[PDB]
Amino acid sequence: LVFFAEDVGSNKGAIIGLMVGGV
Amino acid sequence: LVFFAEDVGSNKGAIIGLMVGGV
Amino acid sequence: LVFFAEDVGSNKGAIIGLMVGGV
Amino acid sequence: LVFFAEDVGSNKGAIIGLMVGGV
Amino acid sequence: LVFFAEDVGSNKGAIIGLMVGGV
Amino acid sequence: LVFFAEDVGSNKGAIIGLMVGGV
Amino acid sequence: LVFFAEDVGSNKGAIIGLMVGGV
Amino acid sequence: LVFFAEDVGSNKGAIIGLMVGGV
Amino acid sequence: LVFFAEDVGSNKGAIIGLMVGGV
Amino acid sequence: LVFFAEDVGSNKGAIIGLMVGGV
Amino acid sequence: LVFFAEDVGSNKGAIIGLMVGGV
Amino acid sequence: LVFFAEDVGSNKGAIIGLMVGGV
Amino acid sequence: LVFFAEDVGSNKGAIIGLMVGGV
Amino acid sequence: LVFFAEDVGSNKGAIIGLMVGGV
Amino acid sequence: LVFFAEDVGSNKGAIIGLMVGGV
Amino acid sequence: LVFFAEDVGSNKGAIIGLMVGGV
Amino acid sequence: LVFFAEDVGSNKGAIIGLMVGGV
Amino acid sequence: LVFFAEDVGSNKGAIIGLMVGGV
Amino acid sequence: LVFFAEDVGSNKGAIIGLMVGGV
Amino acid sequence: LVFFAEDVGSNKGAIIGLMVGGV
Amino acid sequence: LVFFAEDVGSNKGAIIGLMVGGV
Amino acid sequence: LVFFAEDVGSNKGAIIGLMVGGV
Amino acid sequence: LVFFAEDVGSNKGAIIGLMVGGV
Amino acid sequence: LVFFAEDVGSNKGAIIGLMVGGV
Amino acid sequence: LVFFAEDVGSNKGAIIGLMVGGV
Amino acid sequence: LVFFAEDVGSNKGAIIGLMVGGV
Amino acid sequence: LVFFAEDVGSNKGAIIGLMVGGV
Amino acid sequence: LVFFAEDVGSNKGAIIGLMVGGV
Amino acid sequence: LVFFAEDVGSNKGAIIGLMVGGV
Amino acid sequence: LVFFAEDVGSNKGAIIGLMVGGV
Amino acid sequence: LVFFAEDVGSNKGAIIGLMVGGV
Amino acid sequence: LVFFAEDVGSNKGAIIGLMVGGV
Amino acid sequence: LVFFAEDVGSNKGAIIGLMVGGV
Amino acid sequence: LVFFAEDVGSNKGAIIGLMVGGV
Amino acid sequence: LVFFAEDVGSNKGAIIGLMVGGV
Amino acid sequence: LVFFAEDVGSNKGAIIGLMVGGV
Amino acid sequence: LVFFAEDVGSNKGAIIGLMVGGV
Amino acid sequence: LVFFAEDVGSNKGAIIGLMVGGV
Amino acid sequence: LVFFAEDVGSNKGAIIGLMVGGV
Numbered sequence: 011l012v013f014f015a016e017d018v019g020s021n022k023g024a025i026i027g028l029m030v031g032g033v
Numbered sequence: 034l035v036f037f038a039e040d041v042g043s044n045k046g047a048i049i050g051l052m053v054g055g056v
Numbered sequence: 057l058v059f060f061a062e063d064v065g066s067n068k069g070a071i072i073g074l075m076v077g078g079v
Numbered sequence: 080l081v082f083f084a085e086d087v088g089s090n091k092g093a094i095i096g097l098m099v100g101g102v
Numbered sequence: 103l104v105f106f107a108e109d110v111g112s113n114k115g116a117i118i119g120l121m122v123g124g125v
Numbered sequence: 126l127v128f129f130a131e132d133v134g135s136n137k138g139a140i141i142g143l144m145v146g147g148v
Numbered sequence: 149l150v151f152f153a154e155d156v157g158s159n160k161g162a163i164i165g166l167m168v169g170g171v
Numbered sequence: 172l173v174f175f176a177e178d179v180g181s182n183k184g185a186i187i188g189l190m191v192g193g194v
Numbered sequence: 195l196v197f198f199a200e201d202v203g204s205n206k207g208a209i210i211g212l213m214v215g216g217v
Numbered sequence: 218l219v220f221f222a223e224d225v226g227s228n229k230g231a232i233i234g235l236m237v238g239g240v
Numbered sequence: 241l242v243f244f245a246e247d248v249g250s251n252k253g254a255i256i257g258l259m260v261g262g263v
Numbered sequence: 264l265v266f267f268a269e270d271v272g273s274n275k276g277a278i279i280g281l282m283v284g285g286v
Numbered sequence: 287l288v289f290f291a292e293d294v295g296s297n298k299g300a301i302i303g304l305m306v307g308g309v
Numbered sequence: 310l311v312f313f314a315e316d317v318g319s320n321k322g323a324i325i326g327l328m329v330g331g332v
Numbered sequence: 333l334v335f336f337a338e339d340v341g342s343n344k345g346a347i348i349g350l351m352v353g354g355v
Numbered sequence: 356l357v358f359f360a361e362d363v364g365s366n367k368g369a370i371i372g373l374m375v376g377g378v
Numbered sequence: 379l380v381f382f383a384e385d386v387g388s389n390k391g392a393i394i395g396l397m398v399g400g401v
Numbered sequence: 402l403v404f405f406a407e408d409v410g411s412n413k414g415a416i417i418g419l420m421v422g423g424v
Numbered sequence: 425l426v427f428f429a430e431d432v433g434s435n436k437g438a439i440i441g442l443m444v445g446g447v
Numbered sequence: 448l449v450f451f452a453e454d455v456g457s458n459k460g461a462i463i464g465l466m467v468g469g470v
Numbered sequence: 471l472v473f474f475a476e477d478v479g480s481n482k483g484a485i486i487g488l489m490v491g492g493v
Numbered sequence: 494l495v496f497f498a499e500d501v502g503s504n505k506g507a508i509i510g511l512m513v514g515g516v
Numbered sequence: 517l518v519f520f521a522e523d524v525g526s527n528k529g530a531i532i533g534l535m536v537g538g539v
Numbered sequence: 540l541v542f543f544a545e546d547v548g549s550n551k552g553a554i555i556g557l558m559v560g561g562v
Numbered sequence: 563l564v565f566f567a568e569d570v571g572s573n574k575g576a577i578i579g580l581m582v583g584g585v
Numbered sequence: 586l587v588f589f590a591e592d593v594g595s596n597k598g599a600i601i602g603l604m605v606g607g608v
Numbered sequence: 609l610v611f612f613a614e615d616v617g618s619n620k621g622a623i624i625g626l627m628v629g630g631v
Numbered sequence: 632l633v634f635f636a637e638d639v640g641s642n643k644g645a646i647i648g649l650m651v652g653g654v
Numbered sequence: 655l656v657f658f659a660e661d662v663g664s665n666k667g668a669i670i671g672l673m674v675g676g677v
Numbered sequence: 678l679v680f681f682a683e684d685v686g687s688n689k690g691a692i693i694g695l696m697v698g699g700v
Numbered sequence: 701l702v703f704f705a706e707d708v709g710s711n712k713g714a715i716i717g718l719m720v721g722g723v
Numbered sequence: 724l725v726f727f728a729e730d731v732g733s734n735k736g737a738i739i740g741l742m743v744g745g746v
Numbered sequence: 747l748v749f750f751a752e753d754v755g756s757n758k759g760a761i762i763g764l765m766v767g768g769v
Numbered sequence: 770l771v772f773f774a775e776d777v778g779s780n781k782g783a784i785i786g787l788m789v790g791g792v
Numbered sequence: 793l794v795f796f797a798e799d800v801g802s803n804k805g806a807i808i809g810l811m812v813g814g815v
Numbered sequence: 816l817v818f819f820a821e822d823v824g825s826n827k828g829a830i831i832g833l834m835v836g837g838v
Numbered sequence: 839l840v841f842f843a844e845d846v847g848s849n850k851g852a853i854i855g856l857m858v859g860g861v
Numbered sequence: 862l863v864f865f866a867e868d869v870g871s872n873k874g875a876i877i878g879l880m881v882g883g884v
Numbered sequence: 885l886v887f888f889a890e891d892v893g894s895n896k897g898a899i900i901g902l903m904v905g906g907v
Contacts, residue, residue: 016454017039019536019582021069023504025487027050027464027531030433030479040062042490042536044092046458048441050073050485053410053433063085065444065490067115071418073096073439076387076410086108088421088444090138094395096119096416099364099387109131111398111421113161117372119142119393122341122364132154134375134398136184140349142165142370145318145341155177157352157375159207163326165188165347168249168318178200180329180352182230186257188211188324191249191272201223203260203329209280211234211255214272214295226260226283232303234278237295246316247269251299253343257280257326270292276320280303315339322366326349338362345389349372361385368412372395384408391435395418407431414481418441430477437527441487453500456582456628460550462533464510464577467479467525476523483573487533499546502628502651506596508579510556510623513525513571522569529619533579545592548651548697552665554625556602556646559571559617568615575642579625591661594697594743598711600648602671602692605617605640614638621688625648637684640674644734648694660707663743663789667757669694671717671738674686683730686720690780694740706753709789709835713803715740717763717784720732729776732766736826740786752799755835755858759872761786763809763830766778775822778812782849786832798868801858801904807832809853809878812824821845824881828895832855844891847881855876855901870904878899 012035012449014037014451014455017457018037019042019456019490019534020040021044021046021458021488021534023046023458023460025048025462025533026052027485028479028481028527029052029463029466030525031054031468033056033470035058037060041060042065042444042488043063044067044069044442044488046069048071048487049075050439051433051435051481052075053479054077056079058081060083064083065088065421065442066086067090067092067419067442069092071094071441072098073416074410074412074435075098076433077100079102081104083106087106088111088398088419089109090113090115090117090396090419092115094117094418095121096393097387097389097412098121099410100123102125104127106129110129111134111375111396112132113136113138113140113373113396115138117140117395118144119370120364120366120389121144122387123146125148127150129152133152134157134352134373135155136159136161136350136373138161140163140372141167142347143341143343143366144167145364146169148171150173152175156175157180157329157350158178159182159184159327159350161184163186163349164190165324166318166320166343167190168341169192171194173196175198179198180203180260180327181201182205182207182209182258182327184207186209186326187213188255189249189251189320190213191318192215194217196219198221202221203226203258203283204224205228205230205258205281207230209232209257210236211278212251212272212274213236214249215238217240226281226306228281228304232280234301235274235295235297237272242265242311244267244313244317247319248267249272249318250270251274251276251320253276253320253322255278255324256282259282259325259328261284261330263286263332265288267290271290272295273293274297274299276299278301279305282305284307286309311334313336313340316342318341320343322343322345324347328348328351330353332355334357336359336363339365341364343366345366345368347366347370351371351374353376355378357380359382359386362388364387366389368389368391370389370393374394374397376399378401380403382405382409385411387410389412391412391414393416397417397420399422401424403426405428405432408434410433412435414435414437416439420440420443422445424447426472428474428478431480433479435481437481437483439485443486443489445491447493449495451497451501454503456502456536456580458504458534458580460504460506462508462579464531465525465527465573466509466512467571468514470516472518474520474524477526479525481527483527483529485531489532489535491537493539495541497543497547500549502548502582502626504550504580504626506550506552508554508625510577511571511573511619512555512558513617514560516562518564520566520570523572525571527573529573529575531577535578535581537583539585541587543589543593546595548594548628548649550596550626550649552596552598554600554648556623557617557619557642558601558604559640560606562608564610566612566616569618571617573619575619575621577623581624581627583629585631587656589658589662592664594651594663594695596649596665596695598665598667600669600694602646603640603642603688604670604673605686606675608677610633612635612639615641617640619642621642621644623646627647627650629652631654633679635681635685638687640686642688644688644690646692650693650696652698654700656702658704658708661710663697663709663741665695665711665741667711667713669715669740671692672686672688672734673716673719674732675721677723679725681727681731684733686732688734690734690736692738696739696742698744700746702748704750704754707756709743709755709787711741711757711787713757713759715761715786717738718732718734718780719762719765720778721767723769725771727773727777730779732778734780736780736782738784742785742788744790746792748794750796750800753802755789755801755833757787757803757833759803759805761807761832763784764778764780764826765808765811766824767813769815771817773819773823776825778824780826782826782828784830788831788834790836792838794863796865796869799871801835801856801870803833803856803872805872805874807855807876809830810824810826810849811877811880812847813882815884817840819842819846822848824847826849828849828851830853834854834857836859838861840886842888842892845894847879847893849879849895851895851897853878853899856872857900857903858870859905861907870902872902876901879895881893
């Protein structure tokens with residue numbers, strides 16, 4: 011019996027695929 | 034018996050595909 | 057028996073496809 | 080028996096396709 | 103038996119195709 | 126047996142195709 | 149047997165094609 | 172057997188083609 | 195057998211082609 | 218057998234072609 | 241000095257409010 | 264000084280409120 | 287000083303309220 | 310000095326509010 | 333000096349608000 | 356001196372707000 | 379001197395806000 | 402001197418906000 | 425002297441924000 | 448009996464796929 | 471002299487933000 | 494009895510796939 | 517003299533932010 | 540009885556897959 | 563003279579941020 | 586009875602897969 | 609003279625940030 | 632003269648940041 | 655009775671898989 | 678003259694940062 | 701009774717798998 | 724003349740930073 | 747009674763697997 | 770003339786930084 | 793009663809597995 | 816003339832930095 | 839003429855830096 | 862009563878498994 | 885002429901730096 015109590019696989023922060031930052 | 038209690042795979046934060054930031 | 061209780065795959069935050077931010 | 084209780088794949092937040100923000 | 107109880111694929115928030123914001 | 130109980134693919138929020146906001 | 153109970157593809161909110169807002 | 176019970180593709184809200192709002 | 199029960203493609207709300215609102 | 222029960226393509230609300238509202 | 245030279249917010253193409261196309 | 268030179272909010276194309284095309 | 291030079295909100299094309307085209 | 314040379318926010322293509330296409 | 337030479341925020345293609353395509 | 360030569364924020368392709376495709 | 383030669387932030391392909399595809 | 406020769410931040414492919422594909 | 429010859433930050437492939445695929 | 452009390456596999460921080468930072 | 475000859479930061483493949491695949 | 498009290502496999506910090514930093 | 521001949525920081529394969537695969 | 544009190548396998552710091560730093 | 567002949571920092575394979583695979 | 590009091594297998598520092606640093 | 613002939617820092621295989629695999 | 636003939640610092644295999652495998 | 659008081663197997667420092675440093 | 682003929686510093690096998698395997 | 705008071709098997713310093721340093 | 728014929732500093736096997744295996 | 751007071755098996759210094767240093 | 774014929778400093782076996790195995 | 797007061801089996805210095813130093 | 820025929824300084828077996836095995 | 843025929847300085851067995859084995 | 866006051870079996874200096882130093 | 889036929893300085897057995905075995 012493995013009752014999950016809170017979220018599973020949720021994104022509460024940030025995800026970026028591809029970041030490009032020239033100056 | 035694996036009752037999920039809260040969200041699964043929800044986005045509560047942020048997702049970006051492709052970020053480009055020249056100055 | 058895997059009754060989902062709350063949302064699954066919902067977007068409660070933000071999604072951006074492609075962000076471009078020159079100055 | 081996998082009765083979904085709340086929304087699935089709903090957008091409760093925001094989706095943007097392509098964001099462009101020069102100054 | 104996978105009875106959906108609430109909405110599926112509904113937009114309760116916002117969708118934008120293409121956002122452009124010069125100043 | 127997958128009886129949908131509420132709306133499917135309804136827009137209860139907002140959709141914009143193309144937003145342009147100069148100042 | 150997939151009896152739809154409520155609306156499908158209805159617009160209960162707002163749709164805009166192209167929004168332009170200079171000041 | 173997919174008996175639609177309520178409206179399909181009805182507009183109960185608002186549709187705008189092209190909105191222009193200078194000040 | 196897909197008997198439509200209520201309206202299909204009816205406008206119960208509002209449609210605008212082109213809105214222009216200077217001040 | 219797709220017997221339509223109520224109206225199809227009827228306007229029960231409002232349609233405007235082109236709205237112009239200066240002040 | 242932001243002199244607009246050509247049209248602003250003109251429709252040179254097509255706008256449809258609600259399109260329904262059964263066969 | 265924002266002198267508009269040509270038309271603003273003119274319809275040079277086509278606007279349709281509600282199109283229904285069974286065959 | 288925002289002198290409009292040409293037409294504003296004129297219809298030079300076509301407007302249709304409700305188009306129905308069975309065959 | 311940001312003189313716009315051609316159109317801004319013009320529709321040279323197509324806009325549809327809500328498209329429904331059963332067969 | 334940021335003279336825009338061609339169109340800004342014009343729709344030369346297509347925009348759809350909400351597409352529904354059962355068969 | 357950042358003279359834009361061609362279009363900025365134009366849609367030459369396609370934008371869809373919400374696509375629903377049951378069979 | 380950063381003269382942009384071609385398009386910036388144009389959509390030459392496709393954007394979808396929310397895609398739902400049951401069978 | 403950083404003259405951009407071709408497109409910057411253009412979408413020549415595809416962007417999807419939220420994809421849901423039950424069977 | 426860092427002349428960019430081809431595209432920068434263009435999407436020639438595919439971007440998905442959030443993919444959900446139950447069976 | 449292995450009841451999970453808090454989140455499992457949630458992102459509370461940051462994820463980047465591919466970071467590129469020339470100067 | 472660091473002339474970039476081909477693309478920089480382009481997506482020629484695929485990006486996914488958050489993938490969820492129950493069965 | 495191995496009750497997990499706090500998070501398991503959560504990212505509270507940072508993850509980068511591939512970092513490239515020329516100067 | 518460090519002329520880059522082919523792509524730099526391009527994604528020709530695949531990027532996933534967060535993958536969740538229960539069965 | 541091996542009750543875990545705090546996190547297990549959490550990332551509170553940093554993870555990099557592949558770091559490349561020419562000058 | 564350190565002419566790079568092929569790609570630098572390109573992803574020709576796969577990147578995953580966070581993988582979670584219960585059964 | 587081997588109650589773990591603090592973290593087990595957590596990364597509070599740094600992990601790098603493959604570091605390459607030419608000059 | 610240190611001409612690089614093939615790729616440098618490319619990912620032709622696989623990178624995972626954080627893998628969690630309970631059963 | 633130290634001409635590199637094949638790849639340098641490429642990942643042709645696999646990299647994992649943090650692996651956690653309870654049963 | 656072997657109660658662990660602080661961390662076990664935590665990384666509070668640094669781990670590198672493969673370091674390559676030509677000059 | 679120290680011409681490298683094959684790969685240098687490539688990963689053709691496997692790298693793991695931190696492995697944790699309770700049962 | 702062998703109560704461990706501080707860390708066991710923690711890395712507070714540095715670990716390198718394979719170091720290669722040509723000049 | 725010290726021509727290297729095969730790989731130098733390549734990982735064809737396995738590298739682990741920190742292995743922890745309680746039972 | 748053999749209470750360990752400080753760390754056991756901790757790395758406060760440095761570990762290298764395989765060091766290779768040609769010149 | 771000291772031509773190396775096969776690999777130098779390659780890992781064809783296994784490297785572990787720090788192994789901890791309580792029971 | 794053999795209370796250990798300070799570290800046991802800690803590495804405060806350096807460990808190398810295999811050192812190879814041609815010139 | 817001291818041609819090395821096979822590997823030099825390769826690890827075909829196993830290397831461990833620090834092994835700790837309580838029971 | 840001192841041609842080495844097989845391996846030199848290879849590890850075909852095992853190396854341990856520091857072994858600690860309490861019971 | 863054999864209370865150990867300082868470290869036991871600690872490495873405060875250096876350990877090398879296998880050293881190979883051709884010239 | 886002192887042709888070495890088999891291995892020189894290879895470890896086919898075992899090497900331990902520092903062994904500590906209390907009970």
